[PDB]
Design a protein around this ligand. Structure first.
Ligand SMILES: Cc1cc2nc3c(=O)[nH]c(=O)nc-3n(C[C@H](O)[C@H](O)[C@H](O)COP(=O)(O)O)c2cc1C
Ligand SMILES: Cc1cc2nc3c(=O)[nH]c(=O)nc-3n(C[C@H](O)[C@H](O)[C@H](O)COP(=O)(O)O)c2cc1C
Ligand SMILES: [Fe+3]
Ligand SMILES: [Fe+3]
Ligand SMILES: [Fe+3]
Ligand SMILES: [Fe+3]
Ligand SMILES: [O]
Ligand SMILES: [O]
Lengths: 401, 401
């Protein structure tokens, strides 16, 4: 069935236990996800978002079991990405005259995917209202570039429920709907994973938008996102997390990742970490081989880290491709207030370390000196690598000693 | 046992049926590989190369079954990469006084990995000889940057066997040793795969070196490489292939590869291919999703192609990382006389296509106009994509019409 969220609000979405790949293969969902759609039944009946196109047949059928499709008065699209607006064409094929409430940018994104401009769109902007009867109304808030130009939130008065869509959501699949009914650790991990890999480049927009919403003085009993749990128990805890994460978040932590062909760079990475740990016991150190690790776990650690060390060997005068790929993605995520140091081994002329050091600088990292070694590091070379870690640990110390 | 190659030449190497990853994960060996070592037993006993460090215990033990280690007079190292010189430390621990014949650059690479400079190295250069008795001698030929600075070949007179190490070799595992005893198709595929992914950036050096060797007027009955089969039946067929491949090789072929998040770029790629195929029936077209395909198969096709089309969506104002990674590797391989065109879909401001087009130009490709589309291509947009393929097909035509 559907699931009662609160009063006349029904969850009519779809759980996805199997899904492992989002945005191509750029976001690994190791704990699946959910696509949350909501049906509000007052004097007016309002559908908020749909689900992935994959589950369009199930969505419409399940919706029929809950309500006659002709009885649906309004459709609200907070965000026109395929995982929320994917079943729209299938639904609108049954109820073509049904009005769609969304942002001006959403008309471009909806039509961009579905190619049905003849649909009855209603442009909404911040402050706009939609009465649904019984003294209740929907209030719309534009949230451009969080994370799309078309993005917005919908607030329901009386019930005090914020339909935040992607915001404050996470890719975490569970039979239980509410945040207080799931594993808190797995919940936090997926929440932080989501922000770090998706919302980091828009952090400068997060705080003013949240500040703007708080200025509306709207009571919040529940936050119903488009992914994962519904926040009902201390729902603002995820909002406070977003405030902390947005402020160029960093812990006393250093992330080391690299790619290697014959483990020479790996030997350097381990020696560097040893140097750090024996210089500053406060620092948490994580090491990843990018060819053998979870890319999104690496990026989440980078997000949590005060600085990173990136390693690569020289291959055909350039750096290893997986490193080049990862640095490119970091260049998009725009990490702030973080430092970096490039290292790696070479055979003769090298050049990849300097190349990498430049690209990290291009990614926005404050660069420290690079570390280079020839072939396999002997005991003398490993001392230099260990000393490099000492150099980094002292330079990047948050506090003296 | 060992296997008799010819007369007193014995193969004492190692077959690797399981291996799937070389140079980290940069070269996928889908048909395994072999590490060919050779023992020549005349008046003098000569070991040519060893095997991967992984199989050091087996190598030394198998060598003991064939000969007393103390009876080994000379050790020849053509190339000090781990898959040929890996078992050296283990071997030299038993026979430390045994002379090692190699290039001057090899002393740096051998010591770089093994850290035993006390070994008795003998620097050899092109033209140098080593008598082994019975009217036979070894002739050394320096082949720097083919594919390493330390690389060389060893020629055995009388038996007329060229120990070419990496050159003319391939990653192909079989119980049969000779080229005329294996599947010719699988053999050609691995040979071309090897050259395309490894020896392409050194193509300018291949022809003069082969020309230089041919000037020595040395008869060739067999070519014993360090990987895969021993060429005994028309052994120069692989040499002629190398001559063709080195001359900026290209067929009437176009390779299309891309990465996508919601299949918009994929739709463009398919429409482009359709446009090409209906414009020039001579052109062979291959399409790959880089996130779902064999990276080395893509690079082999690029090598065979007269031109490529590369697709990417815009993700956080930059291109998709796997595309960025692949272009970086292509920048190292230095393909020549090839053309390229960037394409892809975007949501609002885009920018990834122009970014990609520039990097392909940096990789050495002659750039044609880019193709851009917003969101999912409708029928009108797909016509433009189909027309783009027509534009490419006509521009890149080897012959009129
Ligand atoms: C395919 C390949 C290409 C290489 N290209 C270069 C190069 O262009 N310049 C250089 O100095 N060394 C080059 N090398 C040597 C490596 O950089 C050297 O072995 C390095 O110490 C190994 O680093 P790693 O084991 O951490 O991957 C190359 C090695 C391989 C296998
Ligand atoms: C995570 C993410 C980031 C995006 N970033 C941008 C961007 O920076 N600029 C832009 O114009 N579109 C951006 N888009 C929109 C996509 O480029 C758009 O959906 C495109 O048409 C999809 O291409 P594809 O399906 O071939 O992957 C982004 C989309 C996603 C999911
Ligand atoms: Fe989204
Ligand atoms: Fe979403
Ligand atoms: Fe090699
Ligand atoms: Fe090799
Ligand atoms: O989304
Ligand atoms: O090699």
């Amino acid at each position: 069935m559907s699931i009662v969220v609160k009063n006349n609000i029904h969850w009519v979405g779809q759980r996805d236990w199997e899904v492992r790949d989002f945005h191509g293969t750029e976001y690994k969902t190791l704990r699946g996800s959910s696509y949350n759609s909501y049906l509000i039944r007052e004097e007016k009946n309002v559908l908020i978002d749909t689900v992935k196109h994959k589950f369009s047949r199930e969505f419409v059928q399940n919706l029929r079991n809950e309500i006659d499709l002709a009885d649906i008065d309004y459709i609200v699209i907070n965000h026109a990405e395929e995982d929320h607006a994917g079943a729209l064409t299938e639904l609108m094929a049954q109820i073509p005259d049904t009005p769609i409430y969304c942002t001006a940018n959403a008309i471009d994104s909806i039509n961009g995917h579905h190619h049905h401009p003849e649909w009855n769109f209603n442009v909404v902007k911040t402050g706009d209202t939609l009465d649904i009867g019984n003294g209740k109304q929907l209030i719309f808030v534009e949230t451009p570039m969080l994370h799309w130009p078309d993005s917005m939130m919908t607030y329901l008065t009386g019930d005090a429920v914020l339909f935040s869509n992607d915001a404050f959501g996470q890719h975490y699949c569970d039979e239980h709907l509410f945040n207080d009914e799931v594993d808190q650790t797995e919940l936090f991990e997926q929440c932080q994973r989501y922000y770090a890999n998706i919302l980091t480049p828009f952090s400068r927009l997060v705080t003013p938008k949240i500040t703007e919403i708080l200025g509306f003085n709207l009571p919040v009993d529940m936050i119903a996102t488009s992914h994962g749990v519904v926040w009902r128990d201390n729902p603002t805890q995820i909002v406070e997390l977003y405030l902390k994460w947005a402020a160029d978040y960093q812990e006393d932590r250093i992330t080391i990742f690299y790619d290697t062909m014959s483990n020479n760079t790996r030997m350097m990475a381990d020696a560097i970490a040893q140097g750090i740990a024996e210089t500053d016991p406060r620092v948490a150190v994580k090491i990843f081989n990018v060819a053998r690790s979870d890319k999104n776990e690496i990026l989440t650690n980078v997000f949590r880290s005060k600085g990173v060390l990136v390693g690569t060997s020289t291959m055909n005068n350039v750096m290893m491709p997986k490193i080049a790929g990862l640095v490119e993605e970091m260049t998009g995520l725009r990490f702030r207030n973080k430092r970096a140091s490039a290292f790696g081994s070479h055979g003769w002329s090298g050049g990849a370390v300097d190349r990498l050091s430049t690209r990290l600088q291009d990614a926005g990292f404050e660069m420290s000196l690079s570390l280079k070694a020839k072939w396999r590091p002997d005991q003398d070379a490993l001392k230099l690598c260990r000393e490099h870690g000492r150099e980094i640990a002292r330079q990047w110390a948050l506090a003296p000693l």
